[PDB]
Amino acid sequence: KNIKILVIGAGVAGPAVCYWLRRFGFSPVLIEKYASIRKGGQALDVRGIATHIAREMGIYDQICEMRTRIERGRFVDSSGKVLHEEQGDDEVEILRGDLVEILMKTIADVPCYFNQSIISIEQNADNVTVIFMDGRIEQYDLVIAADGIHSAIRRMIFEKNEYQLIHLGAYLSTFTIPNYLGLSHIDLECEANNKLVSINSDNNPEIARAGFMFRSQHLLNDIRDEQEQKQFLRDTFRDFGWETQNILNRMPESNDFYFDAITQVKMNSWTKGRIALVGDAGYCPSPLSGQGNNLAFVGAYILAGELKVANGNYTRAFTRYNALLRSFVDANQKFGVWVSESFEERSNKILAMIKSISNGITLPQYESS
């Protein structure tokens, strides 16, 4: 309760760790770079032991409310003809925006500052110094980075040899546009030239959430520039046909637009000194893994937990934090790489794989003494 803690960014894991920290007696603070939380995103499956975690946060019922209601989908060709349609445990498929908002609804007690960015971070035995972009300066006992795959807190506190970012050779994009098709609870996707386009409707009938997935070795100079992301999207899907151009034209007005390149972070240690990485920052499995959503839950839970049992000793708390998840992250990260290799109903062999990897770790209770 005494120690001053800082959580950076509102993700899944970012808000998740805050709630577990607050519930365990701590009083942390959450800061965010964007003016408000970013709700935009695709549907994500909460599964494995993460479903257990969702319940004890009391948000499981809210998740089942916002779960994907989409009834059907069919795989279109370039011309619109239908090649294939709709064919082929406690877990839920829910838009991360709903999940994030549900997570943000839980931590509402916890202070959250948006429009806050860290231009500098320093560390010694006594404290952790932070320099905000607005010029404000503060020192915390511990700092947890929710930044994710591209985390700046990782590059600042770590050198090049300590961690490595692995590129799985594919990109991903999604965003919300008004529905020109007018379809409701339907999903249309066409796979051509190792590229995929996905446009669908959901509980909100007005808007259709589009998406783009293509396998490429191309490297943007700066991956944080949206227009380079957007321009790169057009260049790749130029000549693709079908509904491509009609989607790209309604793109510019989408506020939730998200672009990135599938990658997974490999690090020996997820914590250095008084600073620790959570979520995609340290262990990110990447989108193709599909379990990237869950690692935030398992990580934010064990992180906050190990710090409480530490009784003030953070070094040991972080060492037990690293040791436990590496077994889980390893088996998990390798799944995302395996699916990254690929791209009948015998193919259900992969479904059995996920159920094995998702449940593959044992959570210390931390609740029951």
96 is in an annotated binding site: yes
Closest contact distance (angstroms) between CB of 156 and ligand FAD is 10
Closest contact distance (angstroms) between CB of 13 and ligand FAD is 3
Q: Which of 41, 48, 305, 336 binds ligand FAD (CB under 6 A)?
A: 41
Q: Which of 11, 28, 48, 336 binds ligand FAD (CB under 6 A)?
A: 11
Closest contact distance (angstroms) between CB of 142 and ligand FAD is 17
State the binding string over 207-246 for ligand FAD (x if CB under 6 A, else -): ----------------------------------------
Angle among Cα 143, 41, 332 to the nearest 5 degrees reads 65
CB-based burial label for 198 (10 Å; 0-12, 13-18, 19+): buried
Choose one: 33-41, 76-84, 121-129, 219-227; the region binding ligand FAD (CB under 6 A).
33-41
The answer to whether residue 328 forms part of the interface with ligand FAD (CB under 6 A) is: no
Phi-psi region of 67 (alpha: psi -120 to 50; beta: other; left: phi over 0): beta
Q: Which of 200, 293, 322, 333 binds ligand FAD (CB under 6 A)?
A: 293
Q: Which of 280, 303, 317, 325 binds ligand FAD (CB under 6 A)?
A: 280
Phi-psi region of 255 (alpha: psi -120 to 50; beta: other; left: phi over 0): alpha
- In one-letter notation, the amino acid at residue 356 is S
How far apart CA 73 and CA 85 sit, in angstroms, is 6
Give the length of the chain. Answer: 369
How far apart CA 232 and CA 322 sit, in angstroms, is 37
Cβ atoms of 73 and 186 closer than 8 Å? yes
State the binding string over 122-161 for ligand FAD (x if CB under 6 A, else -): ------------------------xxx---x---------
Instruction: Provide the b/e sequence for 70-100 (b: ≥16 CB within 10 Å).
Output: beebebbeeeeeeeeeeeeeebbebbbbbbb
Cβ atoms of 67 and 96 closer than 8 Å? no
Closest contact distance (angstroms) between CB of 90 and ligand FAD is 19
Closest contact distance (angstroms) between CB of 266 and ligand FAD is 15
Binding residues for FAD, by number, are 10-13, 32-33, 42, 96, 258, 280
Positions that interact with ligand FAD (CB under 6 A) = 8-14, 32-34, 38, 40-42, 96, 117-118, 146-148, 152, 172, 174, 258, 279-280, 284, 287, 292-293, 296
